[PDB]
Amino acid sequence: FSAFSSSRWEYGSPRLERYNGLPSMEILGQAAPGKSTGEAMELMEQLASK
Amino acid sequence: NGKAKVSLITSDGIKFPQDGTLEFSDVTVDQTTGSITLRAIFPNPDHTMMPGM
Structure with missing residues:
Protein backbone atom coordinates (compact mmCIF):
# COMPACT_ATOMS: atom_id res chain seq x y z
CA PHE A 1 0.00 0.00 0.00
CA SER A 2 2.74 2.47 0.82
CA ALA A 3 3.42 2.31 -2.90
CA PHE A 4 0.16 3.69 -4.25
CA SER A 5 -1.20 5.00 -0.99
CA SER A 6 -0.72 8.39 0.56
CA SER A 7 -2.28 9.41 3.80
CA ARG A 8 -2.87 11.90 6.56
CA TRP A 9 -4.55 12.38 9.85
CA GLU A 10 -7.55 14.62 9.73
CA TYR A 11 -10.66 15.71 11.58
CA GLY A 12 -14.06 14.20 11.13
CA SER A 13 -17.02 13.89 13.37
CA PRO A 14 -17.17 10.29 14.62
CA ARG A 15 -20.89 10.63 15.06
CA LEU A 16 -23.53 12.40 12.97
CA GLU A 17 -27.18 13.33 13.24
CA ARG A 18 -29.97 14.20 10.89
CA TYR A 19 -33.35 15.29 12.23
CA ASN A 20 -36.34 14.88 9.97
CA GLY A 21 -33.67 14.18 7.40
CA LEU A 22 -31.72 17.32 8.06
CA PRO A 23 -28.30 17.19 9.67
CA SER A 24 -28.84 18.10 13.27
CA MET A 25 -26.79 18.93 16.31
CA GLU A 26 -28.41 18.39 19.67
CA ILE A 27 -28.13 20.79 22.57
CA LEU A 28 -29.02 20.14 26.20
CA GLY A 29 -29.67 22.47 29.06
CA GLN A 30 -32.16 23.64 31.62
CA ALA A 31 -33.78 26.71 33.05
CA ALA A 32 -31.91 28.49 35.77
CA PRO A 33 -33.30 27.77 39.23
CA GLY A 34 -36.36 29.97 39.63
CA LYS A 35 -36.76 29.96 35.83
CA SER A 36 -39.26 27.90 33.86
CA THR A 37 -38.21 26.14 30.67
CA GLY A 38 -40.28 28.01 28.10
CA GLU A 39 -38.48 31.13 29.25
CA ALA A 40 -35.30 29.23 28.44
CA MET A 41 -36.79 27.82 25.28
CA GLU A 42 -37.88 31.30 24.26
CA LEU A 43 -34.28 32.41 24.64
CA MET A 44 -32.78 29.65 22.58
CA GLU A 45 -35.28 30.65 19.94
CA GLN A 46 -33.97 34.20 20.18
CA LEU A 47 -30.37 33.01 20.28
CA ALA A 48 -31.25 30.37 17.72
CA SER A 49 -32.84 33.14 15.68
CA LYS A 50 -29.59 35.08 15.38
CA ASN B 1 14.64 29.16 -26.69
CA GLY B 2 12.58 26.00 -27.19
CA LYS B 3 14.17 24.96 -23.90
CA ALA B 4 10.97 23.93 -22.11
CA LYS B 5 10.51 22.76 -18.53
CA VAL B 6 8.56 20.28 -16.44
CA THR B 21 13.30 19.95 -19.58
CA LEU B 22 10.73 17.98 -21.53
CA GLU B 23 12.93 16.26 -24.06
CA PHE B 24 10.60 16.33 -27.06
CA SER B 25 7.12 15.50 -28.33
CA ASP B 26 6.60 12.10 -29.85
CA VAL B 27 4.34 11.98 -32.80
CA THR B 28 2.57 8.77 -31.89
CA VAL B 29 -0.97 8.17 -30.71
CA ASP B 30 -1.39 5.22 -28.42
CA GLN B 31 -4.04 3.17 -30.14
CA THR B 32 -6.08 2.32 -27.06
CA THR B 33 -5.49 5.64 -25.30
CA GLY B 34 -4.36 8.03 -28.01
CA SER B 35 -1.45 8.51 -25.63
CA ILE B 36 1.19 10.81 -27.12
CA THR B 37 3.55 10.06 -24.24
CA LEU B 38 6.31 12.67 -24.32
CA ARG B 39 9.86 12.29 -22.95
CA ALA B 40 11.17 14.15 -19.92
CA ILE B 41 14.88 14.20 -19.14
CA PHE B 42 15.50 14.99 -15.53
CA PRO B 43 18.68 15.20 -13.45
CA ASN B 44 19.18 12.81 -10.56
CA PRO B 45 22.28 13.72 -8.62
CA ASP B 46 20.99 11.98 -5.51
CA HIS B 47 19.35 8.99 -7.21
CA THR B 48 16.13 10.47 -5.85
CA MET B 49 14.74 9.74 -9.26
CA MET B 50 15.25 6.00 -9.41
CA PRO B 51 13.85 5.48 -12.91
CA GLY B 52 11.10 2.96 -13.46
CA MET B 53 8.89 4.70 -10.92
Whole structure:
Protein backbone atom coordinates (compact mmCIF):
# COMPACT_ATOMS: atom_id res chain seq x y z
CA PHE A 1 0.00 0.00 0.00
CA SER A 2 2.74 2.47 0.82
CA ALA A 3 3.42 2.31 -2.90
CA PHE A 4 0.16 3.69 -4.25
CA SER A 5 -1.20 5.00 -0.99
CA SER A 6 -0.72 8.39 0.56
CA SER A 7 -2.28 9.41 3.80
CA ARG A 8 -2.87 11.90 6.56
CA TRP A 9 -4.55 12.38 9.85
CA GLU A 10 -7.55 14.62 9.73
CA TYR A 11 -10.66 15.71 11.58
CA GLY A 12 -14.06 14.20 11.13
CA SER A 13 -17.02 13.89 13.37
CA PRO A 14 -17.17 10.29 14.62
CA ARG A 15 -20.89 10.63 15.06
CA LEU A 16 -23.53 12.40 12.97
CA GLU A 17 -27.18 13.33 13.24
CA ARG A 18 -29.97 14.20 10.89
CA TYR A 19 -33.35 15.29 12.23
CA ASN A 20 -36.34 14.88 9.97
CA GLY A 21 -33.67 14.18 7.40
CA LEU A 22 -31.72 17.32 8.06
CA PRO A 23 -28.30 17.19 9.67
CA SER A 24 -28.84 18.10 13.27
CA MET A 25 -26.79 18.93 16.31
CA GLU A 26 -28.41 18.39 19.67
CA ILE A 27 -28.13 20.79 22.57
CA LEU A 28 -29.02 20.14 26.20
CA GLY A 29 -29.67 22.47 29.06
CA GLN A 30 -32.16 23.64 31.62
CA ALA A 31 -33.78 26.71 33.05
CA ALA A 32 -31.91 28.49 35.77
CA PRO A 33 -33.30 27.77 39.23
CA GLY A 34 -36.36 29.97 39.63
CA LYS A 35 -36.76 29.96 35.83
CA SER A 36 -39.26 27.90 33.86
CA THR A 37 -38.21 26.14 30.67
CA GLY A 38 -40.28 28.01 28.10
CA GLU A 39 -38.48 31.13 29.25
CA ALA A 40 -35.30 29.23 28.44
CA MET A 41 -36.79 27.82 25.28
CA GLU A 42 -37.88 31.30 24.26
CA LEU A 43 -34.28 32.41 24.64
CA MET A 44 -32.78 29.65 22.58
CA GLU A 45 -35.28 30.65 19.94
CA GLN A 46 -33.97 34.20 20.18
CA LEU A 47 -30.37 33.01 20.28
CA ALA A 48 -31.25 30.37 17.72
CA SER A 49 -32.84 33.14 15.68
CA LYS A 50 -29.59 35.08 15.38
CA ASN B 1 14.64 29.16 -26.69
CA GLY B 2 12.58 26.00 -27.19
CA LYS B 3 14.17 24.96 -23.90
CA ALA B 4 10.97 23.93 -22.11
CA LYS B 5 10.51 22.76 -18.53
CA VAL B 6 8.56 20.28 -16.44
CA SER B 7 8.11 20.10 -12.69
CA LEU B 8 7.54 16.96 -10.66
CA ILE B 9 5.50 16.41 -7.58
CA THR B 10 6.39 12.84 -6.70
CA SER B 11 4.00 10.43 -4.98
CA ASP B 12 5.48 11.45 -1.59
CA GLY B 13 3.87 14.87 -1.97
CA ILE B 14 7.38 16.21 -2.33
CA LYS B 15 8.19 17.74 -5.69
CA PHE B 16 11.61 16.68 -6.87
CA PRO B 17 14.21 19.32 -5.98
CA GLN B 18 14.35 20.82 -9.48
CA ASP B 19 12.46 20.54 -12.74
CA GLY B 20 13.89 19.14 -15.95
CA THR B 21 13.30 19.95 -19.58
CA LEU B 22 10.73 17.98 -21.53
CA GLU B 23 12.93 16.26 -24.06
CA PHE B 24 10.60 16.33 -27.06
CA SER B 25 7.12 15.50 -28.33
CA ASP B 26 6.60 12.10 -29.85
CA VAL B 27 4.34 11.98 -32.80
CA THR B 28 2.57 8.77 -31.89
CA VAL B 29 -0.97 8.17 -30.71
CA ASP B 30 -1.39 5.22 -28.42
CA GLN B 31 -4.04 3.17 -30.14
CA THR B 32 -6.08 2.32 -27.06
CA THR B 33 -5.49 5.64 -25.30
CA GLY B 34 -4.36 8.03 -28.01
CA SER B 35 -1.45 8.51 -25.63
CA ILE B 36 1.19 10.81 -27.12
CA THR B 37 3.55 10.06 -24.24
CA LEU B 38 6.31 12.67 -24.32
CA ARG B 39 9.86 12.29 -22.95
CA ALA B 40 11.17 14.15 -19.92
CA ILE B 41 14.88 14.20 -19.14
CA PHE B 42 15.50 14.99 -15.53
CA PRO B 43 18.68 15.20 -13.45
CA ASN B 44 19.18 12.81 -10.56
CA PRO B 45 22.28 13.72 -8.62
CA ASP B 46 20.99 11.98 -5.51
CA HIS B 47 19.35 8.99 -7.21
CA THR B 48 16.13 10.47 -5.85
CA MET B 49 14.74 9.74 -9.26
CA MET B 50 15.25 6.00 -9.41
CA PRO B 51 13.85 5.48 -12.91
CA GLY B 52 11.10 2.96 -13.46
CA MET B 53 8.89 4.70 -10.92
